[PDB]
Design a protein around this ligand. Sequence first.
Ligand SMILES: NCC[C@@H](O)c1cccc(OCC2CCC(F)(F)CC2)c1
Ligand SMILES: NCC[C@@H](O)c1cccc(OCC2CCC(F)(F)CC2)c1
Ligand SMILES: CCCCCCCCCCCCCCCC(=O)O
Ligand SMILES: CCCCCCCCCCCCCCCC(=O)O
Ligand SMILES: [Fe+2]
Ligand SMILES: [Fe+2]
Lengths: 505, 503
Amino acid sequence: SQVEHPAGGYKKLFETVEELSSPLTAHVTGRIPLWLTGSLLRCGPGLFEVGSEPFYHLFDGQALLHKFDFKEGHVTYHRRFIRTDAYVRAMTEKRIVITEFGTCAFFRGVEVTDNALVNIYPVGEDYYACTETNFITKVNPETLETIKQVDLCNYVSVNGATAHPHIENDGTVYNIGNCFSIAYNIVKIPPLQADKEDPISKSEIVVQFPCSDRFKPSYVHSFGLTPNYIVFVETPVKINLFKGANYMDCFESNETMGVWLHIADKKRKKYINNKYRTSPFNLFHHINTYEDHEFLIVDLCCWKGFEFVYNYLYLANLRENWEEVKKNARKAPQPEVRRYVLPLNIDKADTGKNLVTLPNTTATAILCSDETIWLEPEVLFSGPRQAFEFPQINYQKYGGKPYTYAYGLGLNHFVPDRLCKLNVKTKETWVWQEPDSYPSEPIFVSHPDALEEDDGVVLSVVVSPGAGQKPAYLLILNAKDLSEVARAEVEINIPVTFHGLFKKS
Amino acid sequence: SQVEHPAGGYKKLFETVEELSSPLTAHVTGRIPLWLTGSLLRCGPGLFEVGSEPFYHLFDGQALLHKFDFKEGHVTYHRRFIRTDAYVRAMTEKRIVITEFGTCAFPGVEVTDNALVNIYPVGEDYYACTETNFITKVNPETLETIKQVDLCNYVSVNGATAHPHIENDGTVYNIGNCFGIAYNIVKIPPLQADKEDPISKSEIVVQFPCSDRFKPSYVHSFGLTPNYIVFVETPVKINLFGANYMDCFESNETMGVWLHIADKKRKKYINNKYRTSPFNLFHHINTYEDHEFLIVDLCCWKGFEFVYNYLYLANLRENWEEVKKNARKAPQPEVRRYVLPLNIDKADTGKNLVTLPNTTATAILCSDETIWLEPEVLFSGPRQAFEFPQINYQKYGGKPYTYAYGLGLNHFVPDRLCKLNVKTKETWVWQEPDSYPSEPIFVSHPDALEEDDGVVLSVVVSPGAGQKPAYLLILNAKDLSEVARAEVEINIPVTFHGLFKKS
Ligand SMILES: NCC[C@@H](O)c1cccc(OCC2CCC(F)(F)CC2)c1
Ligand SMILES: NCC[C@@H](O)c1cccc(OCC2CCC(F)(F)CC2)c1
Ligand SMILES: CCCCCCCCCCCCCCCC(=O)O
Ligand SMILES: CCCCCCCCCCCCCCCC(=O)O
Ligand SMILES: [Fe+2]
Ligand SMILES: [Fe+2]
């Protein structure tokens, strides 16, 4: 049955907070596992207005870096605003100086935002907060101090890069970005070598994907990586470069193209000219990708339709009362977890037939006479305006490999209100939910000696603004069944966070 | 997870049998419900060769009419071959005389009247049918053949489906290919006071347009609500330009699926251009109206390749490892809910029109005014079809509903019975090793309060070394728990469709 939020506590996700001067001690209930040693680092908006000047969109608020430290069953919480050009110049001029995703600021040229509110990832011995532009911000993972701004355009030919780089076990970083005919470039950052030189200075383009439209690249949020293949999903959400204006103003939907799926040989650094085609959807998050007998298994968090989902994420709409939030989502794209199966071996003799001969899937791939391969998905999870989103897996051991388990944030008409575990083989689900509690993306941490895939915990940051309650807490669930293991309660609000990582120490 | 059939018992589904001179008494295990009074009538192929001349396709064998009679907890079984032109002329000339679906006869166009697919009521009469212009009046008590009827003598259609909709007053609706190419809805009225044959009062009430001027789509079934008719135009096309029927089918690679609605009461086609990805469709499950949306529940096969290509007898008779290998590149079966908006507002161009709270089905209004549909998937198993769907038809046909019953096909071999809650997607299964059931037919308890207060009846082939070769299975519709069997000592070949006639 439909869970309701009439009290409107979710509004606290989108309320400005102050940074701390030093870490707070969190009040622990239950038992923090003694093997859990390290830092949960997470990025989100923390400042939603500069004086009387408002930010309009969910992706506009000034980057706030959060840290929960775990040591011997005790927890501290710390947060600092990232000292980006956007933040520093805003504090200096006491106004909005840099144009954000959905907020225009009112020549050196186009001043692109470095507001790194989306994610943080490792490069060599360093950590970088990012958005989706050419600017990433080196940060100190212990003090949360801002170290420097890095312009990727100083190193490689891309106009931007996603907040979802793939990290191989040796520390190699892969990312994708729009580039110049328009194309999409895969960037490779090598591991830190003996010479100890900055790995970003050894950045290179390893392969290029073509674009469906000569002058209009698709919005790309994430991509798939296996040992042998790179998967790129080209969606009908297009950037109109032929466009006072913010970033949102430049987006349009291509009604006729549907979705084009692209594979590249990772090791031979070659685009493969297989024309994979399917019906229109928005895609933000790949769940996982893997190889199975010369098929690519592509697990996706989809939104059914070509209308840009970001149209529904203005702060004015997310701050409305619950009945209005539900009404606003009535005509939105429907979320759905889909498994696509891409055949690598295309035989002309099988023209007109289903090429997906795997025994354990209902996904199909029809070879047409024009050599397009029409894909139908296997649906893994589908709930009415109930999204399985911000997906996480046991990434270190099962990223790019055959796997069973995904963890997700459950969005109820775009409001995060539960944590989900999905068995992608059986479609069995587990749920954690508490009334008037709004969790964040769940991050999986393995028991260090685990042989099983789901032997560990998930960490989520939860906002719980009740009359007589602690306003926020770090939630620790058993990854086996999402049963509660512990909470670390703080006496201050925590706004929405998007992505992060657990840094073991 | 995968159920295996190495013993190859399913071959008995496709083995010739002899008709009976009179009904056999069946051996009852468990308890036949005492409220169950009437006849289970079912049609299928019974003769798969005429001497040394073989039939090649599943839909070629000569029509056999089956009857299980229920009275006071006792059961009889009777079967008679239908005396069609195809059967009579075959017995006369001791060879294949009439061309069947997938078997050419060697010496104008003599169209098959081999009524092996279904039986349905018209007025006080019962008709066995295939999908041609010829239906066969049969005696539901004796299983005697009464008359051949040519629908072309009454209405402008080239054929009609084996899946007419029957309203509670006895009104029959059907669809068929016709000229100016189009698809015609035929209406046969109830028997009136004047007592004249209702078929002589047959009329075309509405016409659906065709996607291709010269190539009609194959149509197996259609949807009916109190106010609407739903027709699904698939990419399986009949190319009118020693051939059999199978030879004339081709797949249109680019059109996908076109969905069509007509106003039933105003007898008008509605020019809403519903479009989706390619699939084969044989069986509509149910259709209903929900706040100016049509809910369209379908048994789909993902792809444009004709599923009938996989149903030649030579392939269905192969050993189990070969049956599985043959199905590897076949379309994948999937139960899908489509939601068709009736109210299209131009102001919502580019958006999802499906505002219903209880579905993930979408309908995107495009600038060219096409409405692109995405389904809600209700059931999906690898080469495991929920097929031959049945509901509590009398009370829930065309209406909001919760429960469907189905035959489970394992790489096209029927090997289980299924119940689906279309709201929660919960399933129930009945399955026994070396047991191959038929379409389940629902019969309501006379004092039923709920939708699933009753039983389903299925005919099961079980040719194990030391077992009765076939039986009538009765399951409780609540949980598909076994209630009774009526065992016979003779084989029963595959049956497609039928009905329970209450007495
Ligand atoms: N988190 C979703 C969007 C957010 O990260 C964001 C914020 C600001 C700008 C932005 O731009 C997206 C992209 C548009 C195309 C581009 F090439 F200019 C590179 C940047 C994206
Ligand atoms: N249900 C399996 C198909 C079977 O009933 C069958 C047997 C023989 C002929 C046949 O024809 C289908 C179709 C062919 C074209 C048509 F226009 F005559 C309309 C009917 C169909
Ligand atoms: C935790 C966020 C809750 C608020 C609403 C979220 C709506 C999610 C829509 C799909 C994914 C959006 C992109 C993920 C965030 C990012 O990486 O920038
Ligand atoms: C009881 C049948 C078992 C043998 C193989 C069945 C394969 C069915 C494929 C999908 C449905 C085909 C059309 C239904 C039959 C009919 O109405 O003529
Ligand atoms: Fe993201
Ligand atoms: Fe049928």
